[PDB]
């Protein structure tokens, strides 16, 4: 009916007027490109050849446009159409049209998209305004859009099959509007939380943490190679930190050349001892924690997500608030390039040896689990003998569940702390967690020590069968193993009942995600 | 032992599962009976006398690993991965390219992908034998380094060796089949397969009609570029209308088979199959058997890839940052077990709940073949030749080429066709 045509999503009002399919748009898969700048995007040649930008023929660009017209649609840097003053679109694709190749002022050559064009880049859903940003085109071989890795966080994009839409402005007026209101360097700091939206991420973050340790010493050739990738370099090699016995620069000393202008910042590393600030060695910091950037020079400190990440007061945020958005763009790009090449030197990996812990660590984890299981058994015996008394506001069942959960959670935390004590400096799980690049201490603990309690609907694994969880357990078993506690680590390997309970927990998480999407989308539409 | 010995001689002993059921050794139990039955996961661990948990077991599981399905049974060491990662691997294993059936030549199915050189996994679950994964495998074993090399493996992407790709690594064939039926609707209006003529047929296109044979159908073995005319069909106009089929844009294939038959109605019916050989590009999607996928970030030649002392360069480099948050340790255990199996010559056993295959035992086995216990290896930088300071985890892991390829997804629009009702750009 006529109402159905106009009513809902896919109706005229919402599906055709509020939003609509548009021309000059291209969608393809995205792959990383550390070499591109923040604002630069990588466009395949075919996408650039289909999309066109109409350029008015002026006396100063008539020669270049006539050359482009001569090349035509076949040769890539060419023109697809010529729009006359009358509005007649001479077609350069179909037949030479030798008389109609002529250009005069006022004609519009629909040239192909070239390097330097401003294009809007979008990922769905566009939750915030940083999800649509203006990028400068660079044409590269192969068929994927290529974007810098610092720009992944605003788009919420990972290169695992994601695709991105690209919209090309068709007028100089709208091109200037996009360039000024929406350029990526201008979108660094969000108004939502007055923090930078973008920060150093993934390999660059871990390599920065390793690079800014006290231990890192770089010889002359490595220093020159890294300075090769610094675009803002003044061409002057800093005097090395250690002149004799052999000239050796430091990772901090080279990173000091990255920091632009004269930026002043004080942060603290993630593994900063709380005792150091109160006690002596406040400004010496035996662990080389803390971070002090004075006059744009990294005097001391190890950088992590707290210094180079998306947080208020970060070196990135201070750079944006002090030096500007263009210089901050250069800052991001230089960090990525020189730290990625140093990472080529030092390298990074994850292996089985990271998951393995000391024999003593495993023994302590086992002893903690034994003690916890014994304490849960004691609590169950108190409950059975009716010694247990209800906690105020809770039933006897609820207070028993709370006590058992507290015991199991404390044991899990103790095993996790033992596993984390086991970790060496060289451990790479610990490297990624400390840098903040990926992972958490919870993940390390589950990998090495104990997967933990599997809980569904906020309670331990329910009695799905008649008064028992699985047919293998006896009826009325409230012990840790029966109700879902997994004492084995991922490396050790879950036992079959633990495997099923873990599957139950993961299923609950997946269901939560899937159900969440639609409710949040409806709320967002209502608010807007 | 009598039953197991007779079943071991199964053929030429006429003893089968039904005889096992008839003997009363095994029994079928449904969920309602599962509610009233005391089960033991394993006979030895549970039935045998110990500190008595239960002394009234009524049944025993044949093997725990049977709780998984078909797609989850290919996952090696699934008990060492996070649970959502096994779901992801089930979904992605439904999308891996392999030899789907042996009669794939006879079948004319639209959108068929078949891999050049499928390999059976070096680390395999026993239940795979009953899924026929050895007979029709989907994926290739590949030397994989878990390293941060040039930043092109960051996020979830994967660096690939271009030399390996050039030697046949993950090369596939994509067959697209087109069906056209000549039919008569009006008594004077009929559709005929013929080569359209510029003057005789009113509707025509720029597209070359020369490749069409006399019957109006392209012969097999002819290269057909995008928008060329596969089938030439003309309709009498009560001069003629061109309803000829064209290639899907950017198909760029070679005709494989052209069959001409009569359908149920008795009208002539034609099926034409087109081969497009797809080599891995830097947009194509590859996934391990552990629920972590990624597009190919870049391709480096064998001179550029990092190399070990022995001269081995990884076929695939995956970012280490994938492992920690996802906690897919089964991937690392599979690399270690694959290294051990490839040096030993056996095929590794990755059944979910073996309890006889620890990581420490695999490490000790790898030590005997001259490698580091944990599988790390001193890698030399391909570009400069200097040793990489951090020793890098290398091993043979089984990887699957998912059907999602960048060439199928790349699209662009500029003043193209427009819908009739909305007069807005079209969809798709």
């Amino acid at each position: 009916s006529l109402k159905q045509r106009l009513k809902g999503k896919e109706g005229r009002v919402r599906g055709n007027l509020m939003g609509k399919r548009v021309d000059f748009s291209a969608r393809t898969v995205i792959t990383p490109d550390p070499n591109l700048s923040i604002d630069q995007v990588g466009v395949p040649r075919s996408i650039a050849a289909n999309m066109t930008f109409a350029e008015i023929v002026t006396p100063f660009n008539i020669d270049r446009l006539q050359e482009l017209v001569r090349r035509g649609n076949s040769q890539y840097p060419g023109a697809k159409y010529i729009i006359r003053d009358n509005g007649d679109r001479i077609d350069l694709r179909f037949h030479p049209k030798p008389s109609d190749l002529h250009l005069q002022t006022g004609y519009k050559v629909e040239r192909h998209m070239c390097d330097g064009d401003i294009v809007i880049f979008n990922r769905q859903p566009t939750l915030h305004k940083m999800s649509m940003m203006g990028h400068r085109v660079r044409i590269l071989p192969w068929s994927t859009f290529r974007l810098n890795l610092s720009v992944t966080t605003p788009y919420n994009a990972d290169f695992d099959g994601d695709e991105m839409n690209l919209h090309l402005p068709q007028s100089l007026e709208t091109r200037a509007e996009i360039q000024e209101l929406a350029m990526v360097p201008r979108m660094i700091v969000t108004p939502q939380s007055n923090r930078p939206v973008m920060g150093i991420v993934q390999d660059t973050l871990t390599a920065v943490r390793k690079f800014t340790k006290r231990d890192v010493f770089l010889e002359r050739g490595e220093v020159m190679n890294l300075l090769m990738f610094l675009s803002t370099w003044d061409g002057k090699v800093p005097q090395p930190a250690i002149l004799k016995p052999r000239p050796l620069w430091t990772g901090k000393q080279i990173f000091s050349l990255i920091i632009p202008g004269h930026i002043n910042c004080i942060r603290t590393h993630s593994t900063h001892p709380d005792d150091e600030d109160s006690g002596p060695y406040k400004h010496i910091s035996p662990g080389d924690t803390k971070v002090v950037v004075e006059n744009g020079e990294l005097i001391m400190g190890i950088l992590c997500k707290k210094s180079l990440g998306t947080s208020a007061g970060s070196l990135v945020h201070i750079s944006y608030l002090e030096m500007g958005h263009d210089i901050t763009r250069l800052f991001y790009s230089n960090i990525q390039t020189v730290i990625n090449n140093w990472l080529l030197i030092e390298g990074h990996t994850i292996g089985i040896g990271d998951s393995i812990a000391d024999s003593k660590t495993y023994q302590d984890i086992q002893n903690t689990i034994k003690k916890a299981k014994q304490d849960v058994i004691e609590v169950i015996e108190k409950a059975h003998n009716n010694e247990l008394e209800p906690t105020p506001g809770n039933t006897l069942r609820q207070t028993f569940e709370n006590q058992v959960n507290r015991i199991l959670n404390d044991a899990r935390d103790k095993t996790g702390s033992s596993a984390q004590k086991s970790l060496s400096e060289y451990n790479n799980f610990k490297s990624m967690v400390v840098s903040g690049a990926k992972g958490s201490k919870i993940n390390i603990s589950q990998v090495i020590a104990v997967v933990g309690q599997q809980n569904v609907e906020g309670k331990r694994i329910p009695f799905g069968f008649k008064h028992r969880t699985l047919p293998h357990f006896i009826k009325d078993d409230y012990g840790p193993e029966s109700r879902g506690f997994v004492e084995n680590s991922y490396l050790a390997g879950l036992t079959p009942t633990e495997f099923f309970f873990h599957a139950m927990g993961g299923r609950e998480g997946l269901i939560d995600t899937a159900v969440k999407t639609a409710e949040t989308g409806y709320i967002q539409r209502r608010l807007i | 032992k009598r039953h197991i010995d007779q079943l071991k001689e199964r053929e030429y002993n006429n003893y089968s599962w039904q005889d096992l059921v008839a003997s009363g050794v095994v029994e079928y139990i449904d969920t309602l009976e599962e509610e009233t039955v005391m089960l033991a996961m394993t006979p030895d661990d549970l039935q045998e006398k110990e500190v008595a948990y239960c002394s009234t077991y009524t049944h025993c599981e044949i093997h725990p690993s049977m709780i998984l399905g078909v797609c989850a049974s290919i996952i090696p060491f699934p008990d060492h991965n996070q649970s959502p990662r096994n779901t992801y691997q089930s979904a992605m294993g439904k999308q891996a390219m392999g030899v789907y059936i042996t009669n794939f030549h006879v079948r004319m199915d639209t959108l068929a992908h078949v891999l050049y050189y499928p390999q059976k996994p070096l680390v395999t679950t026993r239940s795979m034998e009953y899924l026929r994964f050895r007979e029709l495998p989907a994926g290739i074993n590949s030397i994989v380094a878990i390293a941060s090399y040039t930043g092109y493996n960051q996020e979830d992407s994967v660096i690939m060796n271009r030399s390996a790709v050039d030697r046949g690594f993950f090369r596939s064939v994509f067959y697209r089949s087109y069906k056209e039926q000549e039919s008569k609707k009006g008594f004077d209006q009929e559709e005929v397969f013929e080569k359209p003529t510029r003057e005789t047929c009113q509707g025509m296109r720029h597209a070359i009609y020369d490749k069409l044979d006399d019957d109006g159908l392209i012969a097999p073995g002819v290269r057909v570029s995008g928008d060329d005319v596969i089938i030439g069909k003309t309709v009498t106009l009560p001069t003629k209308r061109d309803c000829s089929t064209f290639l899907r844009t950017s198909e760029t294939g070679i005709v494989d088979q052209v069959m001409v038959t009569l359908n149920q109605e008795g009208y002539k019916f034609c099926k034409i199959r087109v081969r497009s050989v797809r080599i891995p590009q830097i947009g194509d999607k590859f996934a391990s058997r552990h629920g972590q996928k990624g597009t190919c970030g870049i391709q480096y030649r064998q001179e550029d890839m990092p190399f070990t002392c022995e001269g081995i360069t990884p076929d695939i480099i995956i970012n280490p940052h994938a492992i920690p948050s996802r906690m897919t340790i089964g991937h690392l255990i599979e690399c270690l077990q694959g290294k051990v199996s490839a040096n030993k010559g056996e095929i590794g056993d990755a059944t979910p709940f073996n309890d006889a295959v620890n990581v420490q035992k695999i490490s000790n086995l790898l030590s005997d073949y001259g490698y580091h216990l944990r599988g790390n290896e001193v890698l030399y930088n391909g570009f400069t030749g200097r040793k990489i300071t951090s020793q890098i985890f290398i091993g043979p892991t089984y990887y699957q080429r998912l059907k999602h390829m960048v060439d199928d997804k790349i699209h662009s629009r500029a003043r193209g066709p427009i819908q009739i009702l909305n007069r807005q750009p079209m969809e798709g």
């Binding site: 309690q453 873990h502 998480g509 | -």
Partner: peptide, 8 residues
């Protein structure tokens, strides 16, 4: 999958 206070 961790605990009651964590995640499932």
């Amino acid at each position: 999958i961790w605990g009651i206070g964590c995640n499932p």
